[PDB]
Write a protein that binds this ligand. Structure first.
Ligand SMILES: NC(=O)c1cnc(N2CCC[C@H](N)C2)nc1Nc1cccc(C(F)(F)F)c1
Length: 288
């Protein structure tokens, strides 16, 4: 390792808050010496009182990992009261915004997104890292290009997306990441979270018992292969739950069972209900 700074503000100009959690905040910051922009995760040291050593081991591994679909941890700074994770800035745009504005959106688009997420988390699991906070807001596009890759853009060093065994207060595993990927896939195909209720206590019971359905009519035009894929990831028993490597082989990801039907109308309509907000000329540039 951690670089030392008496005043982190001598190194970075903090410009814009990007997200605030219970124990950290990510801020868009400019390296004063270079003008380069980064996403700096600011962590108060008091929040890490229970197990500083495990966080130190995790960040040390994160510094060495490198993956297409994972933000790079470029540096670690330390002040008397804070830890600063200097992350690569992903400015391509948010996942749900992109889908709403698309106009044409299919299972193949959703499968392409999940395929990248599966590969990134599989790699993380191979390196001994459990992400623990996989959710749509942590997925950002690398660039504005329509074919841009998606990127896991934040880390969960510390209820709708969390696995039942976590709610049961059972010990975490890599399997909790796989459950979360299944929840992301569910939302990508219908636009609403699999578990909801006005009463928080009844919502807890529904997640704990894994009570969800592929509700009509929203799922009527979704392929059976996609539902089978989600079922194996959103499996209550972690002993029976798909691994990332298993899910990557499923025909919905690795094969051709993902449909090309335009589901944008229903999916974007549900997203708005649940989440608050190259041109080529024929025989000219088309011949590339
Ligand atoms: N790795 C990152 O670049 C990055 C990390 N964390 C975050 N969040 C915000 C979403 C929630 C998450 N737990 C922390 N958002 C990032 N970036 C981001 C977000 C919005 C807008 C822009 C900007 F390009 F317009 F500036 C960048």
């Amino acid at each position: 390792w951690k670089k030392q700074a008496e005043d982190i503000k001598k190194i970075f100009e903090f410009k814009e808050t990007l997200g605030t959690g219970a124990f950290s905040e990510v801020v868009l910051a400019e390296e004063k010496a270079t003008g380069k922009l980064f996403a700096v995760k600011c962590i108060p040291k008091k929040a890490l009182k229970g197990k500083e050593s495990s966080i130190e081991n995790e960040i040390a591994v994160l510094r060495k990992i490198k993956h297409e679909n994972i933000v790079a941890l470029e540096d670690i700074y330390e002040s008397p009261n804070h830890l600063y994770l200097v992350m690569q800035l992903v400015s391509g745009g948010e996942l749900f915004d992109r889908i709403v504005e698309k106009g044409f959106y299919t299972e193949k688009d959703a499968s392409t997104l999940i395929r990248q997420v599966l590969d990134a988390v599989y790699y993380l699991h191979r390196m001994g890292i459990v992400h623990r906070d996989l959710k749509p807001e942590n997925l950002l596009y690398y660039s504005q290009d329509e074919e841009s890759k998606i990127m896991i853009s934040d880390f969960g060093l510390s209820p709708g997306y969390v696995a039942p065994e976590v709610l049961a207060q059972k010990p975490y595993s890599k399997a909790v990441d796989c459950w979360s990927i299944g929840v992301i896939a569910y939302i990508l195909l219908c636009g609403y979270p699999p578990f909801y209720d006005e009463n928080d206590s009844k919502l807890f019971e529904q997640i704990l018992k894994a009570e969800y359905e592929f509700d009509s009519p929203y799922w009527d035009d979704i392929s059976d292969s996609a539902k089978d894929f989600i079922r194996n990831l959103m499996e209550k028993d972690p002993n029976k739950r798909y691994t990332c490597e298993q899910a990557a082989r499923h025909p919905w990801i690795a094969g051709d069972t993902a449909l090309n039907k335009n589901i944008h109308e229903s999916v974007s309509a549900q997203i708005r209900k649940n989440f608050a907000k190259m041109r080529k000329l024929h025989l000219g540039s088309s011949l590339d």
